[PDB]
Short mmCIF file of N, CA and C in Angstrom, two decimals:
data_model
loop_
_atom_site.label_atom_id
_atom_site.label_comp_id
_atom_site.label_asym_id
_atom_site.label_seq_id
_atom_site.Cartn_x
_atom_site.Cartn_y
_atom_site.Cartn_z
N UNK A 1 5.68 18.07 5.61
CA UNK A 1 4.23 18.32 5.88
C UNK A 1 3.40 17.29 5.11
N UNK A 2 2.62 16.17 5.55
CA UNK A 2 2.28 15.21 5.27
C UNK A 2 0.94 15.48 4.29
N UNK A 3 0.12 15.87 5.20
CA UNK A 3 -1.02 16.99 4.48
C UNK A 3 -0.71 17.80 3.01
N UNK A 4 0.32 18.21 3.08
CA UNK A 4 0.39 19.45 2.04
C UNK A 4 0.86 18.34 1.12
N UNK A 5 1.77 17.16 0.93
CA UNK A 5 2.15 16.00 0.76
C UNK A 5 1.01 14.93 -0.29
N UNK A 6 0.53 14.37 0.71
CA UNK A 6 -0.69 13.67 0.38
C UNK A 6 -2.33 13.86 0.40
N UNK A 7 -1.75 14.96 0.59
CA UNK A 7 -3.88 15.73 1.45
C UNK A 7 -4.12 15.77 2.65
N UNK A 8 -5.16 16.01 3.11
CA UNK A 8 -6.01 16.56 4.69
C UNK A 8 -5.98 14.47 5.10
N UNK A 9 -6.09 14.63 6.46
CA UNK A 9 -6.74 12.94 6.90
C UNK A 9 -8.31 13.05 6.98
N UNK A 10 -8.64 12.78 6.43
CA UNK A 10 -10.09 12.49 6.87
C UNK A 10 -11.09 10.96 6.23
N UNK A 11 -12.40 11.06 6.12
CA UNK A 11 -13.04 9.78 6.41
C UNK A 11 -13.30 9.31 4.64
N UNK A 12 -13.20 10.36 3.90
CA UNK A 12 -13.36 9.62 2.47
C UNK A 12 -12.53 8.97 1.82
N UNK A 13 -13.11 7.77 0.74
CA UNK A 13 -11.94 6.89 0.08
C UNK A 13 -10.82 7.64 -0.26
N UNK A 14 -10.97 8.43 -1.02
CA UNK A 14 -9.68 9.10 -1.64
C UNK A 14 -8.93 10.37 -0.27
N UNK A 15 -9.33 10.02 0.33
CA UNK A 15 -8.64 10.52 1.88
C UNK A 15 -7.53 9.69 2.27
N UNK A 16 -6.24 9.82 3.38
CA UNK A 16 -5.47 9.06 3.77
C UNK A 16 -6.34 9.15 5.24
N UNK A 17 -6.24 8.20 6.15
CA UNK A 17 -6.27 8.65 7.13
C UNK A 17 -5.66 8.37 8.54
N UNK A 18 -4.71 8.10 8.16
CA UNK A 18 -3.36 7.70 8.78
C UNK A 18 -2.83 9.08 9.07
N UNK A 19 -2.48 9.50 10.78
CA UNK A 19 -1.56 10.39 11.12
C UNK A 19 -1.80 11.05 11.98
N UNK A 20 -1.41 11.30 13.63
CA UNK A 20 -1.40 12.29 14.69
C UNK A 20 -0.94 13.68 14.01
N UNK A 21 -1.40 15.10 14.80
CA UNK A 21 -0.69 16.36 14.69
C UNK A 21 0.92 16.20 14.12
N UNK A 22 0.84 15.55 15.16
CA UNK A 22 2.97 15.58 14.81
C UNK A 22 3.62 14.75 14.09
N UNK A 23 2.88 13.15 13.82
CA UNK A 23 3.23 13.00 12.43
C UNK A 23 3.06 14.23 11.42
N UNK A 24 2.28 14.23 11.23
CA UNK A 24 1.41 15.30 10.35
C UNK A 24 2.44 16.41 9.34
N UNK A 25 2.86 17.36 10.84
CA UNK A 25 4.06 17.85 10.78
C UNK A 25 5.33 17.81 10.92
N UNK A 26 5.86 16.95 11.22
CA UNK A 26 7.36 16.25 11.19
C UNK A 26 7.73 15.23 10.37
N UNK A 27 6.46 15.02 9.64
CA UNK A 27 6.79 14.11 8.61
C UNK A 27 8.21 12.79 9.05
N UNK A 28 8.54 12.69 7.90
CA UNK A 28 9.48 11.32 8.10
C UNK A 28 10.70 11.51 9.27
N UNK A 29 10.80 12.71 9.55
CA UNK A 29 11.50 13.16 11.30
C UNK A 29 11.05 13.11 12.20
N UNK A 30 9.60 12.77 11.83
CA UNK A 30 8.98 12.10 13.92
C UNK A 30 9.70 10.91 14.36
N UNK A 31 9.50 11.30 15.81
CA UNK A 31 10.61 10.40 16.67
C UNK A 31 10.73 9.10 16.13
N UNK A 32 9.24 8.09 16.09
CA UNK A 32 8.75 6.64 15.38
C UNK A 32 8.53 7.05 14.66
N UNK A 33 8.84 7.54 13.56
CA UNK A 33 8.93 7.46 11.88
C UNK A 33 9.12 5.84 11.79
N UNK A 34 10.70 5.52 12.17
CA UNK A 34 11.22 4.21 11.64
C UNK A 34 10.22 3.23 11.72
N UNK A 35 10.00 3.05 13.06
CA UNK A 35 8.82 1.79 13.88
C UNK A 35 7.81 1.55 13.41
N UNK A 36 7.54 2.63 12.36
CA UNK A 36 5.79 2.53 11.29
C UNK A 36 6.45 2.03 10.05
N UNK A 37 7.36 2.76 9.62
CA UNK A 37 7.76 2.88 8.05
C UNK A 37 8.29 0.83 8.14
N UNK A 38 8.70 0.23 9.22
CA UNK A 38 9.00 -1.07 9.25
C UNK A 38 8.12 -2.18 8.74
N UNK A 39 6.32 -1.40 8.43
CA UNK A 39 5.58 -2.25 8.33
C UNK A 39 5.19 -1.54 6.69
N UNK A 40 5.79 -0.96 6.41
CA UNK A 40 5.31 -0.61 4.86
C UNK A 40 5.84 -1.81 4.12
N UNK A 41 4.89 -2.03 2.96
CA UNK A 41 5.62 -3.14 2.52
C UNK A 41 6.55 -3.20 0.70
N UNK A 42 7.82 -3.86 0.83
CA UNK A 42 9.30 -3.58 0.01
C UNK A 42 8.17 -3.39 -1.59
N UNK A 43 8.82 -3.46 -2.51
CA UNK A 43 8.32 -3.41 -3.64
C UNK A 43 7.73 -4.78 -4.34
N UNK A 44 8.78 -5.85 -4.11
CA UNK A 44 8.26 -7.06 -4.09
C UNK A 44 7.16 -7.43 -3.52
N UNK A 45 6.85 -7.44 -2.00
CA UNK A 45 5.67 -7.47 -0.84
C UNK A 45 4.39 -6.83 -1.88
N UNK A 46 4.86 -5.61 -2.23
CA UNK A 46 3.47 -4.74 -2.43
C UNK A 46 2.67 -5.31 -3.22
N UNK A 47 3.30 -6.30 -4.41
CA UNK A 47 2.21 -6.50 -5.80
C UNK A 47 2.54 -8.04 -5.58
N UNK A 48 3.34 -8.83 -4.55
CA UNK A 48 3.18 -9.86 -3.95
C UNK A 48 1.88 -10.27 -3.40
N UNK A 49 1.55 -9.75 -2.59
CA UNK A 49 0.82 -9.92 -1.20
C UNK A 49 -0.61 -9.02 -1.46
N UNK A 50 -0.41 -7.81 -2.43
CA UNK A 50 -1.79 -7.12 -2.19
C UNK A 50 -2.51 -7.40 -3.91
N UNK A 51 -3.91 -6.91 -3.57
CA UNK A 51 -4.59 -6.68 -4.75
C UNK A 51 -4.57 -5.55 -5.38
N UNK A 52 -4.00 -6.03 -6.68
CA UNK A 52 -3.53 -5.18 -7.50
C UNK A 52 -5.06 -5.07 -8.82
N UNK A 53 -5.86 -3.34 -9.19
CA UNK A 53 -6.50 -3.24 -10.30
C UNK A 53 -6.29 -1.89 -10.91
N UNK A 54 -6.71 -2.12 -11.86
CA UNK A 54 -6.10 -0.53 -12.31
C UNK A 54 -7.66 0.04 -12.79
N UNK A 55 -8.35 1.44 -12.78
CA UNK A 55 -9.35 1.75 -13.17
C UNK A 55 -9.00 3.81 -13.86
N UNK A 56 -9.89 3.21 -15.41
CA UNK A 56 -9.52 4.56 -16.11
C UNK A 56 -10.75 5.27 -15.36
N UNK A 57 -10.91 6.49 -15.13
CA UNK A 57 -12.09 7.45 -14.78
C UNK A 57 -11.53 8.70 -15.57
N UNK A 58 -12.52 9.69 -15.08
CA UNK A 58 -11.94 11.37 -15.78
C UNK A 58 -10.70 11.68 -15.71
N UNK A 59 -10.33 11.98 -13.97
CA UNK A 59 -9.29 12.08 -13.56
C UNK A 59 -7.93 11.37 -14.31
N UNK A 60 -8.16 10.29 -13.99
CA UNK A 60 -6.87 9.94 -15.39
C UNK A 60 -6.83 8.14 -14.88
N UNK A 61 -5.89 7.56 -15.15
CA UNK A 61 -5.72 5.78 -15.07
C UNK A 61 -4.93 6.07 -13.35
N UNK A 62 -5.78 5.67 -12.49
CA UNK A 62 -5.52 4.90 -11.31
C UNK A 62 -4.84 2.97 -11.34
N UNK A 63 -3.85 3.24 -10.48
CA UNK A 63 -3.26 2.06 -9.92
C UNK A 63 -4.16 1.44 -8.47
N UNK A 64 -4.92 0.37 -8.16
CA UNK A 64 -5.64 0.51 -7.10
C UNK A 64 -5.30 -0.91 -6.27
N UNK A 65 -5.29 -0.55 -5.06
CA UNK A 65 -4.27 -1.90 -4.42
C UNK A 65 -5.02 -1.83 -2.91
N UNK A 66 -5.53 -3.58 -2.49
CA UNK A 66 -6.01 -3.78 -1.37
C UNK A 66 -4.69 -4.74 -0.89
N UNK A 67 -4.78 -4.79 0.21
CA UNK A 67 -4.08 -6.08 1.01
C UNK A 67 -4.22 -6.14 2.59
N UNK A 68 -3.48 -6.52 3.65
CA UNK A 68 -2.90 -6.79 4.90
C UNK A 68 -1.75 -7.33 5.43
N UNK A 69 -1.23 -6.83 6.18
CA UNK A 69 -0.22 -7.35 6.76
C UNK A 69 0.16 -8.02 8.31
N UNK A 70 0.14 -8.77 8.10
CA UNK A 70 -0.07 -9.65 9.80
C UNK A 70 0.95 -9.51 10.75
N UNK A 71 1.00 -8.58 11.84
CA UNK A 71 1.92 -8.02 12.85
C UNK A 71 2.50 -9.38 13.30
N UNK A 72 3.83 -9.31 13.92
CA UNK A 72 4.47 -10.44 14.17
C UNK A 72 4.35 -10.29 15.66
N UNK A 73 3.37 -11.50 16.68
CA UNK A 73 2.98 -10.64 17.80
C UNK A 73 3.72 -11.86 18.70
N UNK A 74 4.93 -12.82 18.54
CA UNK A 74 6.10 -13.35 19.06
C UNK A 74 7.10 -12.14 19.18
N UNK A 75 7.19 -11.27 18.23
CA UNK A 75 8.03 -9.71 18.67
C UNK A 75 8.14 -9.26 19.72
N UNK A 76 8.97 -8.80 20.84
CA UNK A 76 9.40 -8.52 21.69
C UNK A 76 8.64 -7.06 21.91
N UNK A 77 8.83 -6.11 21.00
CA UNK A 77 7.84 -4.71 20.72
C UNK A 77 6.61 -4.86 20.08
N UNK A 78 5.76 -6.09 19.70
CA UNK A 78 4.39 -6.40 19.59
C UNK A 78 3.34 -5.03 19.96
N UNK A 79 3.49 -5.23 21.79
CA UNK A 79 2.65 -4.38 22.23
C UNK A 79 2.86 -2.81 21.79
N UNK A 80 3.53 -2.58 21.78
CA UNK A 80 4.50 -1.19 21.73
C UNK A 80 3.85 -0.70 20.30
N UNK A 81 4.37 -1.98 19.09
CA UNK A 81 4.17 -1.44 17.78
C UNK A 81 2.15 -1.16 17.62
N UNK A 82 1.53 -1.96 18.06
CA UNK A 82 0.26 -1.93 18.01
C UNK A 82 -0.83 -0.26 18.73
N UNK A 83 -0.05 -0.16 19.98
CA UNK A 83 -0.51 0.80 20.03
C UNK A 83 0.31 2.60 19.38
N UNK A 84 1.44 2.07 18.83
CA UNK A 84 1.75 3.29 17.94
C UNK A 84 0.97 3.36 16.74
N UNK A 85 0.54 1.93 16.33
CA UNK A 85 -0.36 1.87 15.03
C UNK A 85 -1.59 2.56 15.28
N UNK A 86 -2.22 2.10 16.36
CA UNK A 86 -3.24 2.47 16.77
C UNK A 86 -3.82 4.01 16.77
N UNK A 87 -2.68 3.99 17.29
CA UNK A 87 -2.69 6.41 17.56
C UNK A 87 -2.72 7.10 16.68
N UNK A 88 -2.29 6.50 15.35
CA UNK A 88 -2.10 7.10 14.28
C UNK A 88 -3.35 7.22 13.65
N UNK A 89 -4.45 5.97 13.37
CA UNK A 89 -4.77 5.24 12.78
C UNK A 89 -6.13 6.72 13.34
N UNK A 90 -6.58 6.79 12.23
CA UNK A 90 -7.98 8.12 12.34
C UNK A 90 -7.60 8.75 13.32
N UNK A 91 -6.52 9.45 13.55
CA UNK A 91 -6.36 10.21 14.61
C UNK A 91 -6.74 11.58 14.40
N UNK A 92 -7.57 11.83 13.16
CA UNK A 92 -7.79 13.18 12.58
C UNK A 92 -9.21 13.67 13.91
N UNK A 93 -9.84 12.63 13.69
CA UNK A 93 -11.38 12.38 14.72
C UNK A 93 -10.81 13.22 16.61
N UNK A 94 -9.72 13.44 16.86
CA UNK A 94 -9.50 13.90 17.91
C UNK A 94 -9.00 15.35 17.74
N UNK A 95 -8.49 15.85 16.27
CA UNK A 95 -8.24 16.93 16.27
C UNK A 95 -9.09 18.38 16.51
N UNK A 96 -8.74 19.23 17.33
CA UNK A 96 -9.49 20.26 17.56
C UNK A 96 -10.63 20.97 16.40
N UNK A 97 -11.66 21.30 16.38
CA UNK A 97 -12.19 21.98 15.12
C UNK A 97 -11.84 23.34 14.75
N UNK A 98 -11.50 23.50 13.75
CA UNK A 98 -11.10 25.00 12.98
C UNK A 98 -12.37 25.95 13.51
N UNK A 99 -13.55 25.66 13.63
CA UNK A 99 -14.76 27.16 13.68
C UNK A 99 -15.82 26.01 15.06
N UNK B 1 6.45 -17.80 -2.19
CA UNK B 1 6.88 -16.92 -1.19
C UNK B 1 5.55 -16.22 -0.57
N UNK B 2 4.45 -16.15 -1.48
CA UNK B 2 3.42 -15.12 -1.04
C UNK B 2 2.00 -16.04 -1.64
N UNK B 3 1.71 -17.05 -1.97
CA UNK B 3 0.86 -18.09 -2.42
C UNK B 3 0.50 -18.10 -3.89
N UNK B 4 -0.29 -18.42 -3.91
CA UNK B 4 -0.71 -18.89 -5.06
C UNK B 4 -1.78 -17.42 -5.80
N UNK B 5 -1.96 -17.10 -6.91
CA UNK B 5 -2.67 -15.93 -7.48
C UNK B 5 -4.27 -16.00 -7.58
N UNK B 6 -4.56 -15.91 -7.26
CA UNK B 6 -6.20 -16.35 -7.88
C UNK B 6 -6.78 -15.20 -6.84
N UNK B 7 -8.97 -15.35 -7.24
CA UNK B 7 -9.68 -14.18 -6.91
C UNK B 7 -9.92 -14.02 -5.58
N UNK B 8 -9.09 -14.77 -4.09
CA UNK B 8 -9.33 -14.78 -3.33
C UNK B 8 -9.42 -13.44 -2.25
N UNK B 9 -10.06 -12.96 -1.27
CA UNK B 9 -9.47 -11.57 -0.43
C UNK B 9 -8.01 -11.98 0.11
N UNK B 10 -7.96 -13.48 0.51
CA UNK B 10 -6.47 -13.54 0.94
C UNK B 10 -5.32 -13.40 -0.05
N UNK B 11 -5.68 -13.80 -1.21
CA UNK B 11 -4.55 -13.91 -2.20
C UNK B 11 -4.07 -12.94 -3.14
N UNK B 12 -2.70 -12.90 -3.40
CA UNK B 12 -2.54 -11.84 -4.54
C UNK B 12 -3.01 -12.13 -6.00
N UNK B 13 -3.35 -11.26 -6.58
CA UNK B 13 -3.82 -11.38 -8.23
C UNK B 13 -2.82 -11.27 -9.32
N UNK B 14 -1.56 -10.58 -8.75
CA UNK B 14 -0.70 -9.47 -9.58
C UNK B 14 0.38 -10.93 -10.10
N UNK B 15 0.28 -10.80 -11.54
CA UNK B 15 1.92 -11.70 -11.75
C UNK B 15 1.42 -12.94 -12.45
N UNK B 16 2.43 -13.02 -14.03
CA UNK B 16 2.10 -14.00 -15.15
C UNK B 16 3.31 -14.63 -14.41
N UNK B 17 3.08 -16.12 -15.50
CA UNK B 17 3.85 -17.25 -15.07
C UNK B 17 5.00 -17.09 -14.89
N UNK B 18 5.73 -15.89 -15.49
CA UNK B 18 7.26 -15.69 -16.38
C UNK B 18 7.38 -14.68 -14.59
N UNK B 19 6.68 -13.73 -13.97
CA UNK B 19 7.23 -13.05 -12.98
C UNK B 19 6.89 -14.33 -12.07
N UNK B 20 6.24 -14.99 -11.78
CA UNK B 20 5.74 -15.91 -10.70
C UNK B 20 7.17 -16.45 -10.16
N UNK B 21 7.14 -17.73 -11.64
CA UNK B 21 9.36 -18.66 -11.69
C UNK B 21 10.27 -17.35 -11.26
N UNK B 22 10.01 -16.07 -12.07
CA UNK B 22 11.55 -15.83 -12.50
C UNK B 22 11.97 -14.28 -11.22
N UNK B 23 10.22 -13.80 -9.88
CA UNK B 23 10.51 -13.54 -9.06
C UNK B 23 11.10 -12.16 -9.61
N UNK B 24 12.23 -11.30 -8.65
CA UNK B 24 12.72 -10.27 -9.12
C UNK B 24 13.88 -10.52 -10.08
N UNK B 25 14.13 -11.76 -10.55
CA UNK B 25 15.09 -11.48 -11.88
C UNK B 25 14.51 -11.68 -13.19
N UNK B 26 12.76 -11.22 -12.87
CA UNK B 26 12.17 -11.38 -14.15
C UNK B 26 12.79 -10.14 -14.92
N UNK B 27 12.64 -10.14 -16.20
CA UNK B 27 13.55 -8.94 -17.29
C UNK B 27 12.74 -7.43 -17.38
N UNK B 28 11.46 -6.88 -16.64
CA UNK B 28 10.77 -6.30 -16.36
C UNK B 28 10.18 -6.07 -15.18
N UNK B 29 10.99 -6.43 -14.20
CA UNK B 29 10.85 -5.94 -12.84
C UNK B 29 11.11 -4.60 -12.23
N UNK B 30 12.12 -4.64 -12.63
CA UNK B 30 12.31 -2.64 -12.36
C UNK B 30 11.27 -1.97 -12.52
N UNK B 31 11.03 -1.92 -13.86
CA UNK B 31 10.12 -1.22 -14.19
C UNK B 31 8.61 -1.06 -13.83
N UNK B 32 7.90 -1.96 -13.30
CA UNK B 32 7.03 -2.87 -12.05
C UNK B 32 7.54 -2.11 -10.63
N UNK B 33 8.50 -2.47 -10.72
CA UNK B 33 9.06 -2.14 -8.65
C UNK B 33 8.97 -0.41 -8.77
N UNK B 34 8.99 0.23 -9.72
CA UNK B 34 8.30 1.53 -9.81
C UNK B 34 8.02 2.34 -8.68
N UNK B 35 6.47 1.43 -9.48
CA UNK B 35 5.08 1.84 -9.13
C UNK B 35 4.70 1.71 -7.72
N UNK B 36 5.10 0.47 -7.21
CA UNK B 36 5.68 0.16 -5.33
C UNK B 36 5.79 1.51 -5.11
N UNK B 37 4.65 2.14 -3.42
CA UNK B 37 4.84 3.07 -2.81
C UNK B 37 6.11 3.33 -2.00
N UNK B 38 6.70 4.12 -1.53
CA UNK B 38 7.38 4.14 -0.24
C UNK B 38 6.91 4.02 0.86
N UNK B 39 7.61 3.88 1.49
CA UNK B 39 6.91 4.13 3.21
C UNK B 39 6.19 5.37 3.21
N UNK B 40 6.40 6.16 2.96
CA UNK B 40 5.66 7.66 3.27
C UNK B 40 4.61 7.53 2.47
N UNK B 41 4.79 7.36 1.59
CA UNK B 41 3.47 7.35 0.22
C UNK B 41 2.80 6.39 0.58
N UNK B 42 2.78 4.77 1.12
CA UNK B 42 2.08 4.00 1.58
C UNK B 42 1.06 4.63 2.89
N UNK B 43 1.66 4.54 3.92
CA UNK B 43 1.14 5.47 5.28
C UNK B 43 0.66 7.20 5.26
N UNK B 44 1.11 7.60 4.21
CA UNK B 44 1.05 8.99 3.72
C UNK B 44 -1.10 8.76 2.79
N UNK B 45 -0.87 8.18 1.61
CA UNK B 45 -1.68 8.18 0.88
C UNK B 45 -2.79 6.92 0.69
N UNK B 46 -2.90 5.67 1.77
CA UNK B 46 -3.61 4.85 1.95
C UNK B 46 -4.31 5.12 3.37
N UNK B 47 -5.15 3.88 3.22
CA UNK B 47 -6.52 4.16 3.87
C UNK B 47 -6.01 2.88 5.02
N UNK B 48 -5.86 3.12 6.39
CA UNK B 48 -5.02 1.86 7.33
C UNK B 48 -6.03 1.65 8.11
N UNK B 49 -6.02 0.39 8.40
CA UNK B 49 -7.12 -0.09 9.26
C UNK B 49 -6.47 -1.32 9.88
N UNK B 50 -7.06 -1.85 11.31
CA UNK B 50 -6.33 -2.72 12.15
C UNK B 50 -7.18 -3.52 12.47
N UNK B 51 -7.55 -5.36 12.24
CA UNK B 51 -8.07 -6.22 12.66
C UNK B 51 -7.66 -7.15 13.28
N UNK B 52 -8.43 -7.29 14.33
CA UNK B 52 -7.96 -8.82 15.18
C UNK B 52 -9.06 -9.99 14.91
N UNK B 53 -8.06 -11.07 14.50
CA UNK B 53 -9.08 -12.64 14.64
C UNK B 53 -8.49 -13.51 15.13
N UNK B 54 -8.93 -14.78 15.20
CA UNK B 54 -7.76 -15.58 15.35
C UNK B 54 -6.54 -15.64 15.29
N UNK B 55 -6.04 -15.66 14.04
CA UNK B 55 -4.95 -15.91 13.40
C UNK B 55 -3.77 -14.89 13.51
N UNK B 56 -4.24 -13.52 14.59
CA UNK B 56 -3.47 -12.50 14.86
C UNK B 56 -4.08 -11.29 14.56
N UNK B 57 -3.30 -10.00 14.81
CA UNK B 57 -3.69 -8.67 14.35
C UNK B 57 -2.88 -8.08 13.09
N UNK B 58 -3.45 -8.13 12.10
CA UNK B 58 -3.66 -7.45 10.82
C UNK B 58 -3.46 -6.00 10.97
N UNK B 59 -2.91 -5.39 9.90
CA UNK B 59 -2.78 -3.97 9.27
C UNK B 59 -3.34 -4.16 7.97
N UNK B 60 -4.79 -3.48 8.04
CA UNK B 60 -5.27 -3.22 6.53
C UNK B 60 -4.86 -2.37 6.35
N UNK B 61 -5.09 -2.50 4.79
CA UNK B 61 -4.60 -0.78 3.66
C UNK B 61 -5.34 -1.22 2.39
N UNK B 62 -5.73 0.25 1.71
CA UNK B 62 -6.76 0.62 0.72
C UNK B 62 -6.20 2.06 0.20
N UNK B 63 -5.58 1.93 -1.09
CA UNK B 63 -5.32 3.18 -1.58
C UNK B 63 -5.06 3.05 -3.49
N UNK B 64 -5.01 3.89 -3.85
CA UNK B 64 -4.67 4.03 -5.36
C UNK B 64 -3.68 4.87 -5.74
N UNK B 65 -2.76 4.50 -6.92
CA UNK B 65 -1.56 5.32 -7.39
C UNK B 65 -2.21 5.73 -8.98
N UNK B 66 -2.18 7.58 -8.90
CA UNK B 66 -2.07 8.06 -10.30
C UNK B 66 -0.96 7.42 -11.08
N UNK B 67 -1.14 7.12 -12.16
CA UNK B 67 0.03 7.00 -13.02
C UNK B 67 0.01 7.98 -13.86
N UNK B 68 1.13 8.25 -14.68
CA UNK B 68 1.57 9.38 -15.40
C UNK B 68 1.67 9.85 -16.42
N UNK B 69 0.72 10.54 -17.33
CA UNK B 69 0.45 10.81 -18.25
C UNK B 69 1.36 11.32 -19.33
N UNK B 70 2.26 12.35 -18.51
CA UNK B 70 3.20 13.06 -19.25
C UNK B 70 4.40 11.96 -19.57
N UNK B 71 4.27 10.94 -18.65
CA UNK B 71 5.47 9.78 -18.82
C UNK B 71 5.90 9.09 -20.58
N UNK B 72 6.68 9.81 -20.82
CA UNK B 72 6.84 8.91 -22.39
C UNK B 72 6.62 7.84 -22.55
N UNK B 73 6.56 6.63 -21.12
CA UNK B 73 6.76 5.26 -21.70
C UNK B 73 5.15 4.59 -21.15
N UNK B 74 4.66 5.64 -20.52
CA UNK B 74 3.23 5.70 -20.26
C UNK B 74 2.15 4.40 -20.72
N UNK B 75 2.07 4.53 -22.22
CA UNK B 75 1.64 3.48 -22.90
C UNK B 75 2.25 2.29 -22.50
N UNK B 76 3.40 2.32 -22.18
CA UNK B 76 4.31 0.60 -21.97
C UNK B 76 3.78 0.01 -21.03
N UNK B 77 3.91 1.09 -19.92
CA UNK B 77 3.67 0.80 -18.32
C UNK B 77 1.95 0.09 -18.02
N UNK B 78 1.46 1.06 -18.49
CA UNK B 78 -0.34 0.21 -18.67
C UNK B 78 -0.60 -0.95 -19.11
N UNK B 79 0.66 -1.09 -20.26
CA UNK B 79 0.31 -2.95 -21.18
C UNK B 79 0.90 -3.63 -20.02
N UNK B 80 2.58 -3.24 -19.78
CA UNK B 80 3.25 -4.19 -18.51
C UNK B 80 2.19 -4.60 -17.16
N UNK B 81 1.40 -3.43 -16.35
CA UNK B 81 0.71 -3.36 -15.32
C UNK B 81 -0.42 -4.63 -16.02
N UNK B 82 -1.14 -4.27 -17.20
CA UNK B 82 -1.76 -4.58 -17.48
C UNK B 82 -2.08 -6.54 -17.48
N UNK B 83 -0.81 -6.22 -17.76
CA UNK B 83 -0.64 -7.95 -18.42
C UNK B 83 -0.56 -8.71 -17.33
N UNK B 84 0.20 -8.36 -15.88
CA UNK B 84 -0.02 -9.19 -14.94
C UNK B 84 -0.73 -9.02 -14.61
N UNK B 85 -1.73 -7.98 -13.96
CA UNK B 85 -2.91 -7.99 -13.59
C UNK B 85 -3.90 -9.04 -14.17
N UNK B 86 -4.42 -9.83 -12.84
CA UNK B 86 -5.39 -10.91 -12.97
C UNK B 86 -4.83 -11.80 -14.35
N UNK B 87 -3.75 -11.94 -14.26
CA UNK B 87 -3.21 -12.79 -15.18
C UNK B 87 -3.54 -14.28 -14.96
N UNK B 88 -3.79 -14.59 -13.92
CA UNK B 88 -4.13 -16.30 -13.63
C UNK B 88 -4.69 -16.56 -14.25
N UNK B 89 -5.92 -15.99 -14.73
CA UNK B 89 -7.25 -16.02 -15.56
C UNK B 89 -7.43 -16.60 -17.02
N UNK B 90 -5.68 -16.65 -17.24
CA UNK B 90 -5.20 -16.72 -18.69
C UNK B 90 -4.69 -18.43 -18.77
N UNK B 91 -4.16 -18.94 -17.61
CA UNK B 91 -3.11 -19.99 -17.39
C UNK B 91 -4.08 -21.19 -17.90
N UNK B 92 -3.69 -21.78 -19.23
CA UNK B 92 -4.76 -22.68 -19.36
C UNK B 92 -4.80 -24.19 -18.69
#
């Protein structure tokens, strides 16, 4: 359970907002689990490639990290991977409302 | 492998001269490769966003990792994090 996991998806910074219903709930057993998790990036990549700052507040010392990663769109599944990215990507904005 | 360090949006900041040469057989890498999310925790706990320009379509991401208070080596990990962070800044 991704939610119970990392929190609700929604639109604030400290929000994720990455994830359909069924990601949501099938967590790393949805069908394309693999096909997403391919673009996370290794441990090296992460503090390679992104911006790395760290900031103390109340809460306690945050690790804080920007970057991008440039889809390889000579890939044979290009199209495929883009719109799985896509679906995921604020997919909270389509979910039914609770009240 | 990943360019050069400095304050750019394209460029990374993270990494003194000694991780730059010595890559993952620097003598404090483990301990660094840590803090690296997983896949789940990356896509799980960051903020993803998708741009097209020229140069292709991009996967942004925007997120932050608690570190750990109760961690005994706690103090270490903040100087280690610490020290590469925006380390270029130092290279005279």
């Amino acid at each position: 359970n991704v939610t119970q996991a990392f929190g609700r998806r929604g639109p604030e910074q400290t929000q994720g907002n990455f994830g359909d219903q069924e990601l949501i709930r099938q967590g790393t057993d949805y069908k394309h689990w693999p096909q997403i998790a391919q673009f996370a990036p290794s441990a090296s990549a992460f503090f390679g490639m992104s911006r790395i700052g760290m900031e103390v507040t109340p809460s306690g010392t945050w690790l804080t990290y920007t970057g991008a990663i440039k889809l390889d769109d000579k890939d044979p599944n290009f199209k495929d991977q883009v719109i799985l990215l896509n679906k995921h990507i604020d997919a909270y904005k389509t979910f039914p409302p609770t009240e």
